[PDB]
Amino acid sequence: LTPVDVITAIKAQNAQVAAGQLGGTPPVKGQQLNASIIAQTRLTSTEEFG
Amino acid sequence: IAMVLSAVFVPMAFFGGSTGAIYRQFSITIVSAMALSVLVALILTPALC
Amino acid sequence: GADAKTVQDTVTQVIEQNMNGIDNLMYMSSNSDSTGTVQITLTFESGTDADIAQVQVQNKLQLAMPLLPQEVQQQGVSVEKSSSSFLMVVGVINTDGTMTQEDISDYVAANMKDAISRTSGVGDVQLFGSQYAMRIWMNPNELNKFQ
Amino acid sequence: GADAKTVQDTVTQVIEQNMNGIDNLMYMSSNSDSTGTVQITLTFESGTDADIAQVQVQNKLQLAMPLLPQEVQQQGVSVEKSSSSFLMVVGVINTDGT
Amino acid sequence: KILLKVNQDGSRVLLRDVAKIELGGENYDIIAEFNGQPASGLGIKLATGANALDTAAAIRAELAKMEPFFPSGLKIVYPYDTTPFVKISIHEVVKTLV
Amino acid sequence: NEVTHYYLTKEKNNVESVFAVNGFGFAGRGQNTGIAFVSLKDWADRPGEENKVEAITMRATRAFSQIKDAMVFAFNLPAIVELGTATGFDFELIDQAGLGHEKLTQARNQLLAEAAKHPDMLTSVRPNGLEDTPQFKIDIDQEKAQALGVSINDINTTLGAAWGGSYVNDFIDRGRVKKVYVMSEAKYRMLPDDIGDWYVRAADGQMVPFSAFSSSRWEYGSPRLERYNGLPSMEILGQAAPGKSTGEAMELMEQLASKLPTGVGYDWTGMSYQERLSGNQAPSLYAISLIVVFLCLAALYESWSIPFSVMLVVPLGVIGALLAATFRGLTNDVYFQVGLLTTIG
C-alpha cells in the first residue's frame, strides 16, 4: 500500500454530499408530500474513523 | 427665561440608545427655536413697536 | 440541494470560526434553513459609520473564502448592509395573459434590474421572480435505453 | 478567450448592477480591446473621499467576482485610482549602444 | 444538436433525444399574483440616508421614458407605496401651522 | 386565493388591490409560508370609524378563524419596522456544553411547560421557531458499491444532479449571459419508490439500480437552525401580563433561568439587550435637570428662597395633562412626555 491511497480513501469517505429534495419545484399537479433528503455525514468518532 | 428653557430642554438630548435619536431630535428642534426666538424678540420687536 | 445539516456544517462553521478581531461588534445571529440558505446578521453599536464595518466583514469573508466548497463559491457569497424591510414595491402586469409569469419575471430582471441600481439612495433591490435560464430536464428511461 | 461580442456581453452587463452601493455616484463606462484588455472607469462627484470609494468599489465587485466564471479568478484584476496626466517621464539610454 | 454519443452503429443521439431542453428559470419557489393575474414585483430597499420625495420622481421619469420600449399590454401597478402618506401628513402640518 | 377572493368580494368598498406572494413568508422561507399585501382606496371615500385599518384587521382575523387547517394572521404595519413591542422580550437559550440537538429542544419544552404555570405573570409566551419535521434518510453501502464496481463520486454526482440540480456553465441568449441548469423531470422525483428507477453504469458495462446497494428510512429533524455568538441557541418570545411592569417579570425570568439543567445558559437579544444596556438613567437625568434649573433660577434672582416660589408650580400644570390623559385613554409615550415638558416650561 501507499500513503496516496490512504489520503484518497480518507478524502472520499469523509465528505458531505447534497441529495436534493422530495417533491421539489417545479412540482407535478396532485402532490401531498414534501420532505428533505439526507445522503451522508462526516465521521464523528475515532472508532468510526478506524 | 431663555436660560431656564435651555436648562429644562437640553438634558433630554443626552439620552442614549435608539430612543436617544428621537429624543435629541425634539430637544434640538425646541432648543434652537427658543434660542432664536429670544434673540429676535430682543432685537427686532422694539424698533417695530 | 442541501438540508440544514450540510449548510450549517460546511458553510456556517468556517465563517463563524474565521471571524475574529472586528471592532465595535455588538452581537451576531446566524440562521440556517433547509432550502440551502445561510444568513448571518452582525449588529454593531449605534453611531458607528457602516462602511468600515462592511469592509471589515467583507475582508474576513475573503479570508475565510478558500475553505468553502466549490458550489457555494460558484453561486456567490453576498455581503451587504441591512435596512428597512420594504420601501416600495412596483409590479408589472400584462392584460393579454397569453404568456406565463416566467416571461414577465425574466423581462423585469433583464431590462430593469440594472437600471434601478443606478439611482442614488437605493441600498439594494430584490426581485420576485427568476431570470431566464436554459434548463435540461432529463428522462431516466432514455438513459436506460441508450446506457 | 472571449471575442468582441462575448467579452462585450459577459463583463459589463453582469457587473452593471454591482455598482449600486456608493452614494454621490455619476456613471461608469467600459472599453474592451482586441488585444484582450478590458477597462472599466467609474466616476463620482467632486468631493467624495477617494479611498472609501475605491475600497467600496472593491468590496462591491466582490459581489459578482464569484458570480462570473472561474476565468475571472485566475487572471487577476487591478483596481486603483486613475489620474489623466503623466507627472513626469524619465528615459534611460546607453551611449555605448552595446 | 449537441452531440452526446454515437454508440457503435452511428446512432448519433443528441441532447434532445435523451432530455428535453427549454428556457425557464433557475428557481420556482416564489410566485406572485395581483388580483389573481400573474405578475412580478420589485422590492426596493432605501439607503441609510436618502430622500423620500426625491429618488422616486427620477424613477417615475425613467419609467415614462422606457414606456415606448415595452410590448403591448405591459403596464405597472403600485401595490405598496408610502409617498402619499408623507405628502398628506406634511400638508396637514403646514395647514394647521397657517 | 381564498384570501384574495374574500378581500375582493366582502370588502369591495374598502380594499382596492391585493398582492399575494407565495414562497417568501416572514417566519421561515419554505414552501409552507406565504404573505399578502393589501392596499385600501383613497381616504376621501372611506368615511366613519368602521373603515380604519384597525376596524378592518380584527374583522378579517375573526372571519378567518373558521379555517381549522391553516394559521392565518392579519395585521397592520408597526410604526417602526426595526423595533417594536417594548413590553415584550426576546429571551434566548444557549448551549454551552455541546449536549446535542434533542437535549436543547427538551430543555426548551421543559421551560415552556414550567412557564405555563404562571398565567398571572406571563402572557403569550410562545416560540418563534418551527417544530421538528420528517425527512428522508438514505444510506449508501460502501462495500456493496465497491464490490459491484461503481465509484462513490459517480453515485454522489448522479444523485445530486438528478434530484438537486446542477449549474454547468453560461451562454448568451440575446446579448446577455444566462445560466444553464441540469435537472431531472418533475414526474420522476415525487415519491420514494422511484428511488429504484435510476440506474448507474459500472466498470464492466453493467447497469445497477440504486436500491441494489442502498437503504432508506424516515427521521425527524429541525428544518431551521439558529446560532447565537457561535453557539447553538433557541429563541423564545413572550409578553408581559397586563398591569405589570417588565421589571417585575425580569426577576421571575431569572428565577426560571436559575433552575435549568447544566450546560444550558440564557441570554437576551434584540430590544431586551438594549433595555438592559440602557440602565436606570432617567431618574438621574431628571435630578440633574432639577439641580440645573434650581441653580439657573437662583442665578436669575438673588435670594435663595425666591426660586422656590417658581419651582413648586409644576404639579398645577401636571394635573391637567394627567386628567386629560385619563379622560381620553392615552398612553405614556414620547409625545405625552414632550407635552409635559412644554407645559412646565
Residue numbers in the entry:
A (entry chain A): 198 to 247
B (entry chain B): 445 to 493
C (entry chain B): 51 to 197
D (entry chain C): 51 to 148
E (entry chain B): 248 to 345
F (entry chain B): 592 to 936
From the paper:
AcrB is a key component of the AcrAB–TolC multidrug efflux system, responsible for exporting diverse substrates across the bacterial envelope. Structurally, AcrB functions as a homotrimeric multidrug efflux pump that undergoes a conformational cycling mechanism, with each protomer adopting one of three alternating states: access (loose), binding (tight) or extrusion (open). This asymmetric arrangement enables unidirectional substrate transport. In the present model, the trimeric architecture and domain organization are consistent with this established mechanism. While the global fold aligns well with the reference structure, local differences were identified, particularly in flexible loop regions and surface-exposed side chains. Notable deviations were observed between Asp711 and Glu693, which reside within the PN2 subdomain of the T protomer.
To gain structural insights into a putative complex formed by FtsH and YidC, we performed single-particle cryogenic electron microscopy on detergent-solubilized membrane samples, from which FtsH and YidC were purified using Ni–NTA affinity and size-exclusion chromatography. Although SDS–PAGE analysis indicated high purity of these proteins, cryo-EM data sets unexpectedly yielded high-resolution structures of ArnA and AcrB at 4.0 and 2.9 Å resolution, respectively. ArnA is a bifunctional enzyme involved in lipid A modification and polymyxin resistance, while AcrB is a multidrug efflux transporter of the AcrAB–TolC system. ArnA and AcrB, known Ni–NTA purification contaminants, were also consistently detected by mass spectrometry in Strep-Tactin affinity-purified samples, validating their presence independently of affinity-tag selection.
